[PDB]
Design a protein around this ligand. Structure first.
Ligand SMILES: C=CC1=C(C)[C@@H](Cc2[nH]c(/C=C3N=C(/C=C4\NC(=O)[C@H](C)[C@H]4CC)C(C)=C\3CCC(=O)O)c(CCC(=O)O)c2C)NC1=O
Ligand SMILES: C=CC1=C(C)[C@@H](Cc2[nH]c(/C=C3N=C(/C=C4\NC(=O)[C@H](C)[C@H]4CC)C(C)=C\3CCC(=O)O)c(CCC(=O)O)c2C)NC1=O
Ligand SMILES: C=CC1=C(C)[C@@H](Cc2[nH]c(/C=C3N=C(/C=C4\NC(=O)[C@H](C)[C@H]4CC)C(C)=C\3CCC(=O)O)c(CCC(=O)O)c2C)NC1=O
Ligand SMILES: C=CC1=C(C)[C@@H](Cc2[nH]c(/C=C3N=C(/C=C4\NC(=O)[C@H](C)[C@H]4CC)C(C)=C\3CCC(=O)O)c(CCC(=O)O)c2C)NC1=O
Ligand SMILES: C=CC1=C(C)[C@@H](Cc2[nH]c(/C=C3N=C(/C=C4\NC(=O)[C@H](C)[C@H]4CC)C(C)=C\3CCC(=O)O)c(CCC(=O)O)c2C)NC1=O
Ligand SMILES: C=CC1=C(C)[C@@H](Cc2[nH]c(/C=C3N=C(/C=C4\NC(=O)[C@H](C)[C@H]4CC)C(C)=C\3CCC(=O)O)c(CCC(=O)O)c2C)NC1=O
Ligand SMILES: C=CC1=C(C)[C@@H](Cc2[nH]c(/C=C3N=C(/C=C4\NC(=O)[C@H](C)[C@H]4CC)C(C)=C\3CCC(=O)O)c(CCC(=O)O)c2C)NC1=O
Ligand SMILES: C=CC1=C(C)[C@@H](Cc2[nH]c(/C=C3N=C(/C=C4\NC(=O)[C@H](C)[C@H]4CC)C(C)=C\3CCC(=O)O)c(CCC(=O)O)c2C)NC1=O
Ligand SMILES: C=CC1=C(C)[C@@H](Cc2[nH]c(/C=C3N=C(/C=C4\NC(=O)[C@H](C)[C@H]4CC)C(C)=C\3CCC(=O)O)c(CCC(=O)O)c2C)NC1=O
Ligand SMILES: C=CC1=C(C)[C@@H](Cc2[nH]c(/C=C3N=C(/C=C4\NC(=O)[C@H](C)[C@H]4CC)C(C)=C\3CCC(=O)O)c(CCC(=O)O)c2C)NC1=O
Ligand SMILES: CCC1=C(C)/C(=C/C2=NC(=C\c3[nH]c(/C=C4\NC(=O)[C@H](C)[C@H]4CC)c(C)c3CCC(=O)O)/C(CCC(=O)O)=C2C)NC1=O
Ligand SMILES: CCC1=C(C)/C(=C/C2=NC(=C\c3[nH]c(/C=C4\NC(=O)[C@H](C)[C@H]4CC)c(C)c3CCC(=O)O)/C(CCC(=O)O)=C2C)NC1=O
Ligand SMILES: CCC1=C(C)/C(=C/C2=NC(=C\c3[nH]c(/C=C4\NC(=O)[C@H](C)[C@H]4CC)c(C)c3CCC(=O)O)/C(CCC(=O)O)=C2C)NC1=O
Ligand SMILES: CCC1=C(C)/C(=C/C2=NC(=C\c3[nH]c(/C=C4\NC(=O)[C@H](C)[C@H]4CC)c(C)c3CCC(=O)O)/C(CCC(=O)O)=C2C)NC1=O
Lengths: 172, 324, 162, 177, 44, 172, 177, 172
């Protein structure tokens, strides 16, 4: 897979030249968020069970179809199949957030997810709410500076929530 | 863009938006003189519709500069006008003479009728006319039947119709129809399953076998597996395609079985350390790990999980997954 | 189908190797014995109806119960004797295919694989076919190295029935 | 399309025989029981609007996630299509029982509806819960043990016939499976 | 099917019978909750 | 796999409810016929190589075009693979005799069997006429009055025919 | 077919959101400076075929051997298809600008253009080398930074929409990357 | 994997008759031209890379967009993998030259090779040029009279040109 440093080298080889000096100080903004990316990982990797409990607490309440006799997640391995699938949409986003792109997100999780739910009959309607119940649950969880100094992180809140909606449109 | 229940519409994102937006009917019983931007739009519509979005330049449109003018008073459209366009050198250069007889038949149904013929008894009725009564009655075998005199009254333009339940073709003719239609940016030639030199559906159109209906423009839709039949009567080979059946003790050992469809791997990707093993990069016999790509697997429900890992850690993209 | 030519290809394909001087003498030695083996295949072809019916009677002289016992697995009827003559004609045909290709390819594929499933099901004895093939071995009337090639592929068929 | 009368012909064709008296004994008893089957299928097709009523309004109360905004029966075209998709598949098995052969069901619809449905995105477990809700809806009608409507037949026991429309509808559900 | 035991204020009182085979329903004395997940509180 | 007891478990698990009392007295009728089930499977598998080789022999008699050279069942590789599949249906029919339903016969052996045969090119009308020899060699085998005492087992021999005609209509 | 007026109504029907006036202010920002989109569209569709005039001519000056024997734009037939190949995709760029979504370049063009250009052997590097040339060729009429021409404008910052064509030019090299 | 001798044997067995007298001298013709065929593949294995590097440097001088930065065969991990495919088809035609037929050639190389070249995004018209760039160099040394006694080897190098022509068709 390729990363956020690699694509401006992938456009330095497939174009074919040396480095422009406007390509070098565009990477200064990557380390203007470089420490500020690193504590954003602490708001999601220290709360791994915390989001995926608090979201599937909510998701069968307004949508009681999943717990019906004859519903989808009925047996306990299918209910454990929800929890192994709710976290990886957040885990590969957590791989995408330390990366800075969505290459490894598309490589190992997303490409092969619309049709895999359709072959199994698990709905594309409600695997997007599992994105959306953890979408607002990490907008609140990462927007607080408990341990780190105070300034501007108004970019990267529109990047990890710039990756959940990428996972939302790649499944419906 | 991908979506089935994304905005309540299942087939606008399958590639049939403009084939369901337009209807292309003409409104006057003769083309009126004076204005030449209202009926030339009908002609260049049919020049992409009948030819299958092929490039007709003006260097060959003026070679065919009679046959549209007799339509403007004297021929009907869809019955006579594209019939006259089907008797041209430009129609005979793309869909008759670079390809076999069945491939000329099975591309003519997409051109003329807007469907795919199922089995061989629909190939029987069309190819009983070429070997007896030439080419001009072969083209006019389509135009004077119940399959042509009912769906279009004679002043529309023949559209695509091989997806609806009123077009009572088959259920397999749906599955061939998205082998033939790859969005609105292809042709007979710019189609990977068959170019102009080839034949689209040799086995599958004859034996009525349905296929994996892949949405076009998806991630890794650059896949089609090749053909070699297996067995010792027909002296075939083994190792090219996974089977379409999944019977036996490994049918229901791991639950319900599935057929996956891998797009393709390379040499960087096999290791779990993000690179290439610097060395001789091969074995001694100088083949790949997957020595031909676009391969496929048959796997039960209880090993879908490590196989989906083992494709995706190695650089393989997945076309679709169909249960067997 | 193993031939000498489709075996030295396979060891060349194992090593990624262009066809060296090692694999150009395995295919040359087939050509120095394709002369003697194709006269033996031409001689056994012409004397087929002498050798098939003569071996079918030499079975019946050694094992006389096969022409006497009732039931469908025996040669006691008209159609029982016709299927026995078909079977030695199937056996003698695969001897001549091996002298063409120079090895035991066509009797491995068309004859030997799956043979013991038949001989247990339809109650046919494997010693009925040794006596048919030991007739053909010392009554083909060949000589020299022409006989050496026909006697190699006859007792390959005796050893897969024994 | 195959007929049961056609089924003994290709039975007698690769065999290269004539028609004997042996396999004829199945078909002459099929004649005199033909009226009993003719007393069956007329009530299948004349209560068909109830059978497509309870096809789709019954399966939607046991999974209402398709009328939810985002589901697979939410819009009023997919609401219209699910009313329409079920009234063709019982029309085909009404053809299939008069021939007696399931091959007319196979070549027309049951060869390839499964490969469309995961590209049309609909779930198959919802479909077989809607297939089997017409299964016991069918077998009440052939026996006259239906509750709210009781129809005119003769007196006997068509439980050999009532297994046959249950022998169709599982293969309806196994085709989508 | 059997009388359910001597109801204490316990709001769940397990339905009864039910239909053509069937049974099972969690009653909160009239109101029938039965897995709607009213505790739906994400923390954003 | 499913037997008859596994039917009404899964026929009420999506329904949700418990096992109703009006069904199980039909299922305690089935254990009265439990001793007339196991003799009858013992009647088939004791003669399990005399129903195969007596009906392949009567198949090639009426159809000589399969054992003629250039035929489908010509060579010894493809004769052994013709007697293999003639015994495979004899297993999975008698598996469905002991269980009470068809659902191991048409899930492990008949789900694509004619489309196996259309790809290989074997005559699928002619495997049905070998099976209908094995139907008549086993129904008439399971009406002997030796080895068991007499009594009416006419209900249980229609189930043995009803899976032999289910393989007769699977392969065409 | 999507546009930015109806991008929200396929978003809000996951929510079943009767749209109170909070989310509509981006649409009231879309109707605010949509004249700058409109004053750029007339700066595109009047200067349209001179974008493609130096597209393949800019490609062949640095990638010379496609007019060589064994090229791809060798003959007159091989070259004139390429000039309609580039003019189709720039026609389909500027449909998306006045609409406001990424609809039209995906649901018609890149619903199958990756298998198109590998069915013909169209080189994907040279068919993005021209479009990267046509990237910066298409920003200069919006910017009015051109060496040769000036368009009669009003003077503001269209840099929200000067890179929005480059934010359509990125996902035309999504599949043909 | 068939041979020339095994192809006429396998047509005889499916007809069910012995080999005719016109077929043995058709093969006795084929064995007396064996030393011509052994002299052909000795010429194109004693120059089994001097063909290939001189066919690569011919093609790379002609077509220059292969070596261009951004190219298909630009980098040195896609350069030995270009020289791998140029060296195995010189290997696998020489296996098909010594066999007498080409059913070794299509099944071990060319079955779906233009489908894997479709997946990589490889220009396939230029590799068909490279087989034709290898084809005439292979017959220029087959016609080379050095060290061998002189005779007529006319149709054998037209057979060898037909094997390269069958390879060059099904790669585009
Ligand atoms: C070595 C591992 C490593 C970490 C675990 C993090 C933690 C971390 N963040 C910052 C530094 C910072 N951290 C933030 C982050 C935030 N402030 C906010 O208002 C947001 C709510 C919150 C994001 C969740 C900001 C804005 C700064 C820079 C301080 C400033 O702007 O003046 C610093 C001080 C050094 C520096 O400036 O880089 C450290 C150690 N960074 C790291 O390098
Ligand atoms: C609405 C969507 C839509 C499109 C995008 C085009 C897509 C398209 N492109 C081509 C076809 C082509 N397009 C190119 C173009 C190029 N190759 C290069 O190396 C250059 C970099 C690049 C020019 C910019 C070439 C060379 C052909 C092939 C023409 C030929 O084979 O002679 C064809 C085949 C038409 C025919 O020949 O009949 C089609 C359908 N058409 C559409 O309807
Ligand atoms: C979930 C919401 C819900 C409904 C929409 C109704 C629909 C409904 N009806 C029946 C069950 C049935 N439905 C019919 C159909 C009919 N009866 C007639 O006589 C008419 C002519 C015809 C049109 C109405 C029949 C015959 C039965 C079997 C019961 C019987 O009458 O014997 C069943 C049980 C089938 C099953 O699930 O296995 C359901 C769910 N009941 C519900 O609980
Ligand atoms: C042989 C019979 C026969 C059929 C069934 C249909 C097969 C079929 N069904 C649908 C299409 C459909 N069919 C259904 C029906 C259902 N989906 C569900 O979720 C439920 C399980 C089930 C109702 C019981 C729905 C909801 C659509 C979607 C319509 C759409 O996508 O616009 C379409 C697409 C129609 C189009 O694109 O124009 C086709 C071809 N045609 C036939 O000839
Ligand atoms: C014009 C339209 C038309 C029809 C409707 C049928 C009418 C019909 N039904 C039956 C006759 C019958 N139908 C049944 C069938 C049943 N009885 C039951 O107890 C079950 C509820 C049900 C299906 C199992 C039985 C048992 C008989 C009597 C046996 C017989 O003679 O067929 C008969 C033969 C005897 C008679 O003349 O009445 C006829 C002609 N045929 C037609 O031509
Ligand atoms: C392990 C293997 C095994 C079996 C196969 C059965 C065999 C078996 N069957 C019967 C007993 C019997 N078995 C039959 C059965 C038949 N009579 C017929 O005419 C038919 C040909 C045939 C059915 C296939 C009858 C009619 C009786 C006596 C009635 C009865 O069981 O009460 C008995 C005596 C005990 C009893 O009466 O139940 C036993 C041990 N039990 C086993 O433990
Ligand atoms: C080797 C040969 C060679 C060429 C053919 C040109 C091709 C070319 N043109 C432009 C770039 C451009 N081309 C145009 C097009 C036009 N200007 C107008 O106003 C006219 C109306 C219209 C036709 C003349 C515009 C507006 C730009 C961007 C700015 C500019 O150069 O004016 C660019 C820069 C794009 C980029 O940055 O990637 C290039 C490489 N350059 C070369 O090196
Ligand atoms: C049918 C044809 C038709 C149109 C195209 C529009 C024409 C049009 N364009 C603008 C207006 C404008 N256009 C620009 C744009 C720019 N200024 C620059 O120098 C930048 C280079 C460029 C930014 C990309 C700006 C800044 C305005 C004024 C703000 C506004 O959009 O209202 C205005 C508003 C000015 C006014 O109120 O009079 C109008 C009416 N109307 C029409 O009837
Ligand atoms: C009376 C005069 C007279 C000659 C000089 C030869 C001349 C001659 N030499 C060769 C051709 C040849 N002649 C030989 C034979 C040999 N090369 C050697 O290295 C060895 C010393 C020698 C014995 C093995 C070979 C091997 C060739 C072919 C290779 C070559 O051309 O170098 C040929 C072509 C075919 C042929 O052999 O006839 C001819 C005409 N012929 C004549 O009539
Ligand atoms: C073990 C490895 C092995 C070899 C390398 C060759 C080497 C070789 N070639 C020939 C013999 C020959 N070689 C050739 C071939 C040719 N002559 C030409 O001038 C053409 C360039 C070329 C055609 C392709 C001919 C034509 C003969 C027979 C000489 C003659 O015609 O009288 C002979 C003499 C005996 C024989 O025919 O076999 C030998 C040993 N044979 C082998 O067994
Ligand atoms: C490599 C990373 C990876 C991905 C992307 C992946 C997808 C994946 N999800 C699966 C199942 C599943 N996924 C779900 C999840 C849901 N269904 C719903 O209705 C809910 C809305 C939703 C969340 C609770 C369920 C219920 C199944 C089991 C399907 C079944 O048994 O019917 C399966 C089948 C095997 C299994 O049960 O795990 C795969 C391969 N698996 C992986 O290992
Ligand atoms: C079993 C025998 C066999 C077949 C059938 C086969 C096909 C094959 N060709 C490949 C690559 C390739 N093939 C080429 C060849 C070319 N590209 C060009 O521009 C030239 C026109 C042409 C030859 C000079 C190149 C450059 C690659 C590497 C592409 C990549 O790695 O992305 C790969 C990818 C793995 C690899 O590096 O080998 C396969 C599997 N490989 C095999 O081992
Ligand atoms: C090419 C490879 C090949 C072999 C070897 C082969 C053997 C073969 N021999 C058979 C029968 C037979 N084979 C015999 C032969 C004999 N019984 C005797 O009494 C004699 C001693 C002896 C002759 C030497 C008889 C009588 C039958 C008929 C058995 C029956 O009808 O049940 C049958 C049963 C079908 C039939 O021919 O009617 C097969 C498949 N088939 C093959 O395809
Ligand atoms: C798990 C259970 C199972 C089933 C259901 C099955 C079907 C099956 N039958 C096959 C072949 C076959 N089946 C037959 C059988 C016949 N053809 C005829 O013409 C006769 C009418 C009939 C024999 C009486 C023949 C001749 C082959 C071809 C064998 C070969 O090509 O090697 C093959 C190809 C592999 C092989 O056996 O060689 C499969 C997979 N195989 C299984 O393992």
């Amino acid at each position: 897979m390729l990363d956020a440093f690699a694509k401006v080298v992938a456009q330095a080889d497939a174009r074919g030249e040396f480095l422009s000096n406007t390509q070098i100080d565009a990477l200064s903004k990557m380390v203007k968020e470089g420490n500020q990316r690193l504590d954003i990982v602490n708001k999601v990797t220290s709360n791994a069970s915390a989001i995926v409990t608090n979201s599937a607490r909510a998701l069968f309440a307004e949508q009681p179809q999943l717990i019906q006799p004859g519903g989808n997640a009925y047996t306990s391995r299918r209910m454990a199949a929800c929890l192994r699938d709710m976290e990886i949409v957040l885990r590969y986003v957590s791989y995408a957030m330390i990366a800075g792109d969505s290459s490894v997100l598309d490589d190992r999780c997303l490409n092969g997810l619309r049709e895999t739910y359709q072959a199994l009959g698990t709905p594309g309607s409600s695997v997007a709410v599992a994105i959306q119940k953890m979408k607002d649950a990490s907008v609140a969880l990462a927007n607080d500076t408990t341990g780190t100094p105070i300034g501007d992180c108004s970019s990267l809140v529109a990047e990890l929530a710039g990756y959940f909606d990428r996972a939302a449109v790649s499944v419906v | 863009r991908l979506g089935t229940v994304s905005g309540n519409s299942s087939l606008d994102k399958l590639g049939l938006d403009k084939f369901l937006s337009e209807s292309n009917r003409a409104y006057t019983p003769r083309a009126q003189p004076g204005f030449s931007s209202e009926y030339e739009q009908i002609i260049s519509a049919t020049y992409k519709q009948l030819f299958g979005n092929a490039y007709i330049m003006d260097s060959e449109r003026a070679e065919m500069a009679k046959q549209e003018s007799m339509f403007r008073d004297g021929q009907l459209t869809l019955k006579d006008f594209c019939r006259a366009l089907a008797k041209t050198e430009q129609y005979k250069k793309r869909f008759f003479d670079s390809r076999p007889l069945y491939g000329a038949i099975e591309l003519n149904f997409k051109n003329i009728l807007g469907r795919t013929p199922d089995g061989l008894e629909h190939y029987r009725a069309k190819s009983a006319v070429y070997d007896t009564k030439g080419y001009e009655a072969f083209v006019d075998a389509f135009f004077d039947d119940g399959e042509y005199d009912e769906v279009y009254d004679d002043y529309t333009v023949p559209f695509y119709r091989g997806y609806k339940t009123e077009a009572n073709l088959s259920m397999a003719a749906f599955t061939h129809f998205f082998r033939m239609v790859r969005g609105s940016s292809t042709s007979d030639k710019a189609n990977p399953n068959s170019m102009q030199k080839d034949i689209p559906l040799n086995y599958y159109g004859i034996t009525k076998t349905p296929l994996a209906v892949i949405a076009p423009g998806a991630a890794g839709t650059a896949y089609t597996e090749s053909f070699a039949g297996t067995g010792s009567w027909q002296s075939g080979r083994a190792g090219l395609n996974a089977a379409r059946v999944a019977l036996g003790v490994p049918a229901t050992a791991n639950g319900k079985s599935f057929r996956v469809e891998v797009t393709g791997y390379t040499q960087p990707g096999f290791g779990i350390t993000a690179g290439t093993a610097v060395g001789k990069l091969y074995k001694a016999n100088k083949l790949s790990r997957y020595p031909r790509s676009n391969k496929s697997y048959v796997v039960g429900f209880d090993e879908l999980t490590p196989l989906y890992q083992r494709i995706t850690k190695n650089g393989g993209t997945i076309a679709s997954i169909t249960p067997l | 189908m193993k031939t000498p030519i489709t075996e030295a290809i396979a060891t060349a394909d194992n090593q990624g190797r262009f066809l060296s001087n090692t694999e150009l003498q395995a295919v040359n030695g087939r050509y120095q014995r394709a002369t003697a083996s194709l006269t033996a295949a031409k001689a056994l072809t012409g004397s087929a109806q002498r050798l098939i019916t003569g071996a079918a009677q030499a079975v019946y002289n050694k094992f006389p119960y096969t022409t006497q016992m009732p039931g469908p697995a025996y040669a006691s009827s008209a159609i029982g004797k016709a299927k026995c003559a078909r079977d030695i004609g199937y056996y003698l045909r695969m001897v001549t295919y091996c002298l063409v290709v120079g090895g035991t390819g066509p009797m491995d594929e068309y004859l030997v694989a799956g043979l013991e499933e038949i001989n247990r099901s339809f109650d046919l004895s494997p010693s009925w076919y040794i006596e048919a093939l030991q007739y053909i071995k010392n009554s083909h009337g060949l000589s020299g190295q022409v006989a050496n090639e026909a006697n190699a592929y006859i007792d390959y068929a005796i050893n897969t029935l024994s | 399309m195959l007929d049961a009368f056609s089924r003994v012909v290709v039975n007698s064709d690769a065999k290269a025989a004539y028609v004997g008296g042996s396999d004829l004994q199945a078909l002459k008893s099929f004649i005199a029981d033909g009226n009993k089957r003719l007393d069956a299928v007329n009530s299948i097709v004349s209560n068909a609007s109830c059978m497509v009523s309870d096809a789709v309004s019954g399966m939607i109360c046991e999974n209402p996630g398709l009328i939810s905004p985002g589901g697979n029966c939410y819009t009023n075209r997919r609401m219209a299509a699910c009313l329409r998709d079920g009234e063709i598949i019982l029309r085909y098995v009404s053809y299939a029982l008069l021939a007696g052969d399931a091959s007319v069901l196979e070549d027309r619809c049951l060869n390839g509806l499964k490969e469309t449905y995961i590209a049309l995105g609909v779930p198959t477990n919802s479909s077989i819960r809607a297939v089997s809700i017409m299964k016991a809806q069918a077998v009440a009608f052939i026996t006259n043990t239906a509750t709210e409507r009781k129809m005119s037949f003769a007196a006997g026991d068509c439980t050999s016939l009532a297994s046959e429309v249950a022998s169709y509808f599982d293969r309806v559900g196994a085709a989508i499976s | 099917p059997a009388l359910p035991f001597p109801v204490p204020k316990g709001d769940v009182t397990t339905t009864m019978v039910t239909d053509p085979t069937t049974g099972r329903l969690k009653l909160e004395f009239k109101v029938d909750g039965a897995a709607v997940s009213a505790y739906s509180d994400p923390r954003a």
